[PDB]
RNA sequence: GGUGAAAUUCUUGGAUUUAUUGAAGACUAACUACUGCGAAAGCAUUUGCCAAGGACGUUUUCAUUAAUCAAGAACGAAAGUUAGGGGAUCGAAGAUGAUCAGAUACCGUCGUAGUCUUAACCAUAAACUAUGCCGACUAGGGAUCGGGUGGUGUUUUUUUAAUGACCCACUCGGCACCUUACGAGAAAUCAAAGUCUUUGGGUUCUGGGGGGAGUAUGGUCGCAAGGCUGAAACUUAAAGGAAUUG
């Protein structure tokens, strides 16, 4: 019987949305589905800022950022545990971490 | 087996006078030989420098300028404005959810004959007391905002030469002029001319190039 | 009183040659036998003769044309490619 | 067997019985 | 301030690391050495180990050619590919600032489409 | 014997008072009474003839000269034309793509006429019967019908012998092979139905 | 906020007085009775130029219609075609005094 | 290069990387959401033209003109089909490198039809909300989209109203959400899946144990692949739904 009252992710009044390509396995899943996570980081990561700010010219300067929006299919997100299985009731909560 | 790096010479790259710091750096080309001029492999080169390096301020931190060298003389190479782009990091940061992204572009020739495509970008903003979470524009807003931005692009570029446009961009007179026209319509946070592409170039004319370079 | 179902003009060919070619010929034969609109006189009097040439029965203007139809598909698209490139040169 | 392929299985059969019936015209 | 400014273009994919230095114009490259040159692995071509190890020779060759300063432009594979920076990309950038070369003006140039050109793997994914 | 029409184009004699008629291959849209301007300073409309240097890249042209003043060579067949790819003012040279798919470099003074040759889709209609192929070649030359070389006797051909109609040796023939050895597939670098689909690089 | 042209000619057709065709407009162009001539875009450059030289002479306003003599006649609400229309009496229609 | 690890492959004809310029074909990123529009399939760069549409507003008009529908008709993803164009990318078949006891596969390389387009076919998808339409009634909550009303609201410019944009209240019509259970249900759950043994507002459609079977046959449409219509003999005590504990 029906598992989620959203079925997959949210459509409710459309009927078709273009698919997107999974970022890990390269699957096809409708963009309405497909767990998406914003990925922002510094170019210099963690320990390098020391040796980066010392070797660098300029006073200060600043750290640029890498901005990437990841799309997973249901298979990869579960396997990469970008998400995990919750209890019958806990599944209902759409609220973030 | 030659370790060719003792072959080549060194030339000092010169920026246009429309900028502040006019010594960009250096570069190497092989030594001029019979049936190879080092000016040949020198000419078509294009250099991308940050406008922070050019103007010296960090308010220009993103905004890269392409600089193409037309001619070389006596270890110096004179470069002209080849275009401007926005440094993807800066571009990505300004794109955010819960807002309308508006883009516009126009292609227009300048007074000196230069065919240019210039791009603009803006975003809607919540304002003051606004309790709704998104602040998207209506379609009718964006149509009229794009019409206004392009009106200004064609106007500001039409009367001007390649240097006036350059001289206009550094202060960002266009951004401010855009915000003025647009606020009757919709709040419109940020705003920029984010790119300018060289499409057609006139015939050589060292005269205009020496007037830009040289005297100072 | 509808006469043929499928063949139309190609009932002349009867049974012969195989349908696929009878169909294929049906296409171009209706085209070449069809009457067309004239650019100059604005009536539909243009007929073919001698494939490639299309003359108007009223105003007697004759136009080089496609084999079995007046305008070639790739012609008209070339017609614009030239106007497009010619306007580049004069403006 | 998976219901799509059993639908393919019987589609092939039907073609072959149309061919065999076509022998006698 | 002086120095002399080259550009270090670092391409880090997931099977290799690219450490490539040219002058302010991409013509006339100074020093280019990758990760598969410093090990015989085929797996460890992309390891941070080789990435650091490759940026030694470049920076040694930058001194020998005389480039004292670098701008760094870092890129993933891009196009229809991964888009996520490769593992060697941080080690390489660190080894370059660690070798005594002066850094500045880092940007991420990995190529992104306006959404083109259907991606590999055929809609059912690469399934394992 | 020509698919495509010809259009008869009347000029004034420059050095004597009289008419001079020229026979042009009608360019699909050319028409009776239309004016046709000829030379370097002609406009870019269809049916006028220009030098090749004097047109932009992308310009599609018909009956273009091989050397300037040979009064036309390339792409005269019904439906055909040549596209100008580019120009090279170092020795006056425009490179063009010929209907065969090949890329040719000729002198930009080589003239062509704007547009494509008329007569459209002639080869798209099935001949349908031999009598149509008959009248076809009647007006052309005696190439038709054709008797297969396997159908003849060894005396009549290399395909020759019998008891079974068969070629019995490779039907691809050395380029350097002697006339009377050359029938079948001649210089072929390959054979078979290709499925390649690219008519040029 | 714009009335096109055919909408203008429609009023001229019920409320005005007009003549159609190359003969009756020149019969009208000579006599001075014509305030407008509307020429089909596809009539020949000679008939355009003889109509022109009958107009510039007579101080008569010449509208170059955009379209063929098929659509021109539909624009005057007739089932046949006309290459040229001559306006004698403007009716409730403003065609003379408008931007045209 | 490529992978978990390899290999097939490409390379001192300089592969890969870098630079300048150009060619082709497809796609339309980020903005993009429990947001919008269309009868459904479906629909995302700009600008122009072409006719269309809901809702709202209305002391305008007609006056029962309607609701639902056998037959009949329009549209109908993808694949596939016919001629022509196109043919970058991905990629059925095929061919390969590996894995494996085998490996016709899953992973790797090459790649045909295809993928795009014109003009024709085809008429099917878990074409899903697995939920016919029109009408009335029965309960609470806060967001959001479109229109309208109400304000000595706020923020805008030389403060000038405007128009905008925002804020609060109201109200119609939307895509949805949250709580509840008066009620319903085999339960999962349902704001309809309620107002049904206290059984009746109007109407279309479909099912009657599981198999055989969506087969056979006839008919019909289709170029074909196929679609629509669609049995029976015989076989069998279960098949199945939801929930529960292991
Ligand atoms: Mg389950
Ligand atoms: Mg669907
Ligand atoms: Mg009869
Ligand atoms: Mg490797
Ligand atoms: Mg592939
Ligand atoms: Mg595969
Ligand atoms: Mg898995
Ligand atoms: Mg003979
Ligand atoms: Mg033959
Ligand atoms: Mg024969
Ligand atoms: Mg014999
Ligand atoms: Mg012999
Ligand atoms: Mg022999
Ligand atoms: Mg023989
Ligand atoms: Mg035989
Ligand atoms: Mg034989
Ligand atoms: Mg976009
Ligand atoms: Mg929207
Ligand atoms: Mg289809
Ligand atoms: Mg298809
Ligand atoms: Mg085809
Ligand atoms: Mg292809
Ligand atoms: Mg295979
Ligand atoms: Mg086939
Ligand atoms: Mg109801
Ligand atoms: Mg409510
Ligand atoms: Mg107010
Ligand atoms: Mg102000
Ligand atoms: Mg809605
Ligand atoms: Mg009760
Ligand atoms: Mg029920
Ligand atoms: Mg029963
Ligand atoms: Mg039953
Ligand atoms: Mg039964
Ligand atoms: Zn996946
Ligand atoms: Zn005519």
Measured distance CA(B161)–CA(B81) in Å, rounded: 11
Chain breaks in chain B (C to N over 2.5 A) after: none
Measured distance CA(A81)–CA(B131) in Å, rounded: 35
The answer to whether the CB atoms of C63 and F58 lie below 8 A apart is no
Q: Of B59, B82, B58, B62, nearest to B70 (Cα)? A: B82
DSSP label of E102: B
What's the CA gap between F68 and F54, in Å, rounded? 13
Q: Is B214 helix (H, G, I), strand (E, B) or coil?
A: coil
| Residue of B102, B71, B101, B67 lying closest to B85 (CA atoms) | B67
Q: How many alpha carbons lie under 13 Å from residue F106 in its C-beta half-sphere? A: 28
Q: Helix, strand, or coil here: B143?
A: helix
d(CA E30, CA E40) in angstroms, rounded, equals: 25
G16/A61 Cα distance (integer angstroms): 79
Cα→Cα distances B142→B103, B124, B153, B174, Å? 9, 10, 16, 18
**Whole-angstrom distance, CA of residue B29 vs CA of residue B72:** 12
User: C66 Cβ partners below 8 Å, 6+ apart?
Assistant: C52, C72, C75, F28, F118, F119, F120, F121
E126: domain range?
Answer: 1-128
Q: Which helix (DSSP H) or strand (DSSP E) does residue B165 occupy? A: helix B162-169
Spatial contact of F159 and F182, defined as CB atoms under 8 Å apart: no
Beta-carbon neighbour count of residue F180 at 10 Å? 8
Q: What is the DSSP letter of F120?
A: T
**Nearest partner of F46 among B26, C84, G54, judged by Cα:** C84
How far is Cα E56 from Cα A9, in angstroms, rounded to an integer? Answer: 49
Domains: count for chain A: 1
- List, in order, residues 6 or more apart from G26 with CB less than 8 Å away: G51, G54
Entry resolution in angstroms?
3.7
Contact map slice: G 22-51 vs C, CB within 8 A: 40, 42, 44
Both tokens of residue E26?
A: 């991409």
What is the C-alpha separation between B191 and B148, in angstroms, rounded?
13
Three-state DSSP class for B140? helix
| CA atoms within a 13 Å half-sphere pointing along the CA-CB vector of A72 | 15
Beta strands in F63-163 (DSSP E): 82-88, 93-97, 103-107, 111-114
Residues 6+ apart with CB under 8 A from F4: C52, F25, F26, F77, F78, F79, F117, F118, F119, F122
| CA dihedral sign of residues G10, G14, G20, G25 | negative
F182, with CB counted inside 10 A (0-12, 13-18, 19+), is middle
Domain count, chain E: 1
B93 touches chain A (CB under 8 A): yes
Pick the residue from chain E with its C-alpha nearest to B5. Answer: E65
Q: Are strands F82-88 and F103-107 parallel, antiparallel or unpaired?
A: unpaired
Chain H footprint bases within 7 A of protein beta carbons:
1-7, 16-21, 25-38, 40-48, 83-84, 86-92, 106-109, 112-113, 128-131, 143-147, 153-156, 162-168, 175-179, 187-190, 193, 213-217, 225-226, 241-243
Please give the distance, rounded to the nearest whole angstrom, from the Cα atom of residue A46 to the centre of ligand 7. 32
Q: Report the C-alpha gap between E99 and E58 in whole angstroms.
A: 10
Question: Which residues have a C–N gap over 2.5 Å right after them in chain E?
Answer: none
Q: Which helix H or strand E contains B106, and what residues bound it?
A: strand B101-109
Which residue, among B98, B92, B145, has the nearest Cα to B120 in the 3D structure?
Answer: B145
Asked if residues G36 and G65 have their Cβ atoms less than 8 Å apart, the reply is no
How far apart CA G43 and CA G50 sit, in angstroms, is 11
Pairing relation of β-strands F49-51 and F60-62?
Answer: unpaired
> Which residue has 């060759």 as its token pair?
E61
Residues near C6 by beta carbon (within 8 Å), at least 6 away in sequence: none
Dist CA B152 CA F132 (whole Å):
67
- Please tell me the distance from the alpha carbon of residue E73 to that of residue E6, in angstroms, as a whole number: 11
Nearest to A68 among E1, E84, E127 (CB): E84
Q: What angle do CA F114, B199, B42 make, to 5 degrees?
A: 110
A20 to chain E: closest CA residue: E123
Experimental method: X-ray
Q: Which of F54, F43, F79, F50 is nearest to F64 (CA)?
A: F50
Please list every residue in chain B whose beta carbon sits closer than 8 Å to the beta carbon of residue E28: 8, 27-29, 41
d(CA B32, CA D7): 76
CB E13 within 8 A of CB E82: yes
Element (H, E) at B139: helix B139-158
Residues in C whose CB is inside 8 Å of some CB of F read 13, 16-17, 21, 24-25, 28-29, 50-53, 60-69, 71-72, 74-75, 78-79, 81-82, 85-86, 88-89
Domain of residue A57, residue span: 1-97
Secondary structure element (H or E) that encloses residue G58, with its range = helix G45-58
Cβ pair F108, F97 in contact under 8 A: no
Residue F118: DSSP 8-state: S
CB contact under 8 A, B25 and E4: yes
**In Å, what is the CA distance from B202 to each residue of B18, B105, B109, B111, B164?**
19, 22, 10, 11, 16
In chain F, where does DSSP find H-type helix? 130-138
Counting as contact any 3 or more CB pairs under 8 A, the partners of C are: F, G
Q: What is the DSSP string of E36-91?
A: GGS-S-SSGGGSHHHHHHHHHHHHHHHHHHT--EEEEEEE---TTS--SPPTHHHH
Pick from E79, E120, B92, E74: which is nearest to A24 by CA? E120
- 3-class SS letters over D1-17: CCHHHHHHHHHHHHHHH
The CA–CA distances, whole Å, from B175 to A58, B115, B119 equal 27, 21, 12
Structure-token pair, residue G39: 């020429």
Return the ∠ at Cα B63 (arms to B59 and B65), rounded to 5°. Answer: 125
Given a contact cutoff of 8 angstroms between Cβ atoms, the answer to whether C42 and F14 are in contact is no
Q: Which of F139, F153, F149, F140 is nearest to F183 (CA)?
A: F149
CA–CA separation, F139 and F118 (whole Å): 20
Closest CA to A33 of A64, A66, A4, A1: A4
Q: Report how far residue B69's alpha carbon sits from residue B43's, in angstroms, rounded to the nearest whole number.
A: 6
Q: Which of A67, A83, A82, A72 is nearest to A26 (CA)?
A: A72
Tell me how far apart the alpha carbons of residues F26 and F116 are, in angstroms, rounded to a whole number: 9
C-alpha triplet G55, G60, G65: angle, nearest 5°: 80
Backbone angles phi, psi at A54, to 5 degrees: -75, -50
- Per DSSP, C55 falls in state E
Q: Subunits with at least 3 CB pairs below 8 A relative to chain B?
A: A, E
Whole-Å CA distances, B42 to B13, B71, B92, E24 = 11, 8, 34, 12
Q: How far lies B9's CA from each of A63, B28, B30, E4, in Å?
A: 35, 6, 6, 14
Q: Which two tokens stand for residue A6?
A: 């959203």
Q: What is the DSSP letter of C59?
A: T
CA nearest neighbour of B171 among B138, B149, B201, B193: B193
Q: What angle do CA A19, A25, A26 make, to 5 degrees?
A: 35
Separation between Cα atoms, residue B134 and residue B137, nearest integer Å: 9
Q: How far apart are CA E70 and CA E22, in angstroms?
A: 9
């Amino acid at each position: 019987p029906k598992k989620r009252a959203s079925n997959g992710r949210n459509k409710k009044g459309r009927g078709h949305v273009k698919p997107v390509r999974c970022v890990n396995c390269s699957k096809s899943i409708p963009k309405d589905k497909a767990i998406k996570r914003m990925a922002i980081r510094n170019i210099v990561e963690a320990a390098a800022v020391r040796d980066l700010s010392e070797a660098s010219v300029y006073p200060e300067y600043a750290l640029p950022k890498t901005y990437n929006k990841l799309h997973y299919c249901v298979s990869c997100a579960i396997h990469a545990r970008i998400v995990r299985v919750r209890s019958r009731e806990d599944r209902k909560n759409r609220a973030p971490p | 087996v030659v370790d060719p790096f003792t072959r080549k010479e060194w030339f000092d790259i010169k920026a246009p006078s429309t900028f502040e710091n006019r010594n960009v750096g250096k570069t190497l080309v092989n030594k001029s030989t019979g049936l190879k001029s080092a000016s040949d492999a020198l000419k078509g080169r294009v250099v991308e420098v940050c406008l922070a390096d050019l103007q010296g301020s960090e308010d220009h931190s993103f905004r890269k300028i392409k600089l193409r060298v037309d001619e070389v003389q006596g270890k110096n190479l004179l470069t002209n404005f080849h275009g401007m782009d926005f440094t993807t990091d800066k571009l990505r940061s300004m794109v955010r959810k819960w807002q309308t992204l508006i883009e516009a572009n126009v292609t227009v020739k300048t007074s000196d004959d230069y065919v240019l495509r210039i791009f603009a970008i803006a975003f809607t903003r919540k304002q003051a007391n606004q309790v709704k979470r998104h602040s998207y524009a209506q379609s009718s807003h964006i149509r009229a905002i794009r019409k206004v931005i392009s009106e200004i692009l064609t106007k500001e570029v039409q009367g001007s030469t390649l240097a006036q446009l350059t001289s206009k961009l550094i202060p960002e007179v266009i951004n401010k002029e855009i915000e003025n026209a647009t606020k009757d319509i919709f709040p419109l946070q940020n705003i920029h001319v984010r790119k300018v592409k060289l499409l057609k170039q006139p015939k050589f004319d060292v005269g205009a190039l020496m007037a830009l370079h040289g005297e100072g | 009183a509808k006469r043929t179902k499928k063949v139309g003009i190609t009932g002349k060919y009867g049974v012969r040659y195989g349908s696929s070619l009878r169909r294929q010929v049906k296409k171009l034969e209706i085209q070449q036998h069809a009457r067309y609109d004239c650019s100059f006189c604005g009536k539909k009097t243009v007929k073919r003769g001698a494939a490639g040439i299309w003359t108007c029965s009223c105003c007697k203007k004759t136009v080089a044309g496609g084999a079995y139809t007046v305008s070639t598909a790739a012609a008209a698209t070339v017609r614009s490619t030239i106007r497009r490139l010619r306007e580049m040169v004069e403006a | 067997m998976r219901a799509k392929w059993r639908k393919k299985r019987t589609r092939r059969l039907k073609r072959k019985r149309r061919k065999v019936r076509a022998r006698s015209k | 301030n002086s120095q002399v400014f080259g550009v270090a273009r670092i391409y880090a994919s997931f099977n290799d690391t690219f450490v490539h230095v040219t002058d302010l114009s991409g013509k006339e490259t100074i020093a280019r050495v990758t990760g598969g040159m410093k090990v015989k692995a085929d797996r460890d071509e992309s390891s941070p180990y080789a990435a650091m190890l490759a940026a030694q020779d470049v920076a040694a060759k930058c001194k020998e050619v005389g480039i004292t300063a670098v701008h760094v432009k870092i890129r993933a594979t891009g196009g229809t590919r991964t888009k996520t920076p490769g593992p060697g990309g941080q080690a390489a950038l660190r080894a370059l600032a660690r070798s005594g070369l002066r850094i500045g003006r880092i940007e991420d140039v990995t190529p992104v489409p306006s959404d083109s050109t259907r991606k590999k793997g055929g809609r059912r994914g690469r399934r394992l | 014997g020509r698919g495509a029409p010809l259009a008869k184009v009347v000029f004034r004699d420059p050095y004597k008072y009289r008419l001079r008629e020229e026979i042009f291959i009608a360019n699909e849209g050319v028409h009776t009474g239309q004016f046709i301007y000829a030379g370097k300073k002609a406009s870019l409309n269809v049916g006028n003839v220009l030098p090749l240097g004097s047109v932009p890249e992308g310009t599609i042209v018909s009956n273009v000269e091989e050397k300037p003043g040979d009064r036309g060579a390339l792409a005269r067949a019904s439906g055909n034309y040549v596209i100008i790819i580019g120009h090279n003012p170092d020795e006056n040279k425009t490179r063009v793509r010929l209907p065969s798919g090949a890329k040719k470099v000729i002198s930009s003074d080589a003239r062509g006429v704007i547009g494509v040759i008329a007569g459209g889709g002639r080869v798209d209609k099935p001949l349908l019967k031999a009598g149509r192929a008959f009248h076809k070649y009647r007006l052309k030359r005696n190439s038709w019908p054709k008797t297969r070389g396997v159908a003849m006797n060894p005396v009549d051909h290399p395909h020759g012998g019998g008891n079974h109609q068969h070629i019995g040796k490779a039907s691809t023939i050395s380029r350097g092979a002697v006339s009377g050895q050359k029938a079948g597939l001649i210089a072929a670098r390959r054979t078979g139905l290709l499925r390649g689909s690219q008519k040029t690089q | 906020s714009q009335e096109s042209i055919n909408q203008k000619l429609a009023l001229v057709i019920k409320s005005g007085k007009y003549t159609l065709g190359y003969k009756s407009t020149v019969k009208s162009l000579r006599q001075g009775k014509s305030k407008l001539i509307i020429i089909a875009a596809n009539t020949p450059v000679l008939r355009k130029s003889e109509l022109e030289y009958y107009a510039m002479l007579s101080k008569t306003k010449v509208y170059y219609f955009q379209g063929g003599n098929n659509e021109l006649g539909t624009a005057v609400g007739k089932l046949f075609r006309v290459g040229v229309v001559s306006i004698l009496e403007a009716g409730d229609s403003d065609i003379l005094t408008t931007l045209a």
